[PDB]
Amino acid sequence: YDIQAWKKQCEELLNLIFQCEDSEPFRQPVDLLEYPDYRDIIDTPMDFATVRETLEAGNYESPMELCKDVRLIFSNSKAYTPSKRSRIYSMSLRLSAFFEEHISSVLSDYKSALRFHKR
């Protein structure tokens, strides 16, 4: 029932994501010189370095907020992809499955700890 345990759990999961080859396109904010129409399609850029820095700054209150930003990485990739068969979109779908498999216990444990705290 540790209300703070999610933060190190999320740091560890981000470490695993940075070791995945599938994260390489998503580790840093998109380069607009490579993709000059990106901000015509994507309103809110997001990447894993931004998520890690926000976490380490103490600017997430809950793992739900981190999860929303990570899911934005994946919805941006789906929105920007010219094809469902894209290399970089295909990498996003595997990485998303990995992330979702690992974040589910982090969210469940946090929400259970908060319920215990307010019992």
Ligand SMILES: CC(C)NC(=O)N1CCN(C(=O)c2ccco2)CC1
């Ligand atoms: C750090 C750097 C390597 N990032 C990028 O230049 N990428 C990452 C995100 N991208 C896509 O989600 C996408 C879908 C289909 C084609 O690109 C756009 C391009």
